[PDB]
Amino acid sequence: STKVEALHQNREMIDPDKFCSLCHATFNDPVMAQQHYVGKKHRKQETKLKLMARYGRLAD
């Protein structure tokens, strides 16, 4: 995970490190990050976690 640090913008695009708190997933490229945030697995797990948190109010 140390990576071959160079960041040479001559032909390579910007590659920020990113994370998803709904799916517990990490990304290290622009398209990798973007693809996660719009994929079926992100939608499905977002609904699952949202339902778990919303319905979890079993006491008052």
Cα–Cα dist 13/2, whole Å: 19
Residues in contact with Zn ion, shown as a per-residue x/- string from 14 to 53 under the rule CB under 5 A: ------x-xx------------------x-----------
- Which CB sits closer to Zn ion, 15 or 23? 23
Structure tokens at 46: 């977002």
Give 13 or 38: the residue with its C-beta nearer to Zn ion. 38
Distances (CA, A) of 45 to 19, 23, 34, 54, 55: 14, 6, 16, 14, 15
- Indicate the residue among 24 and 54 with the shorter CB distance to Zn ion: 24
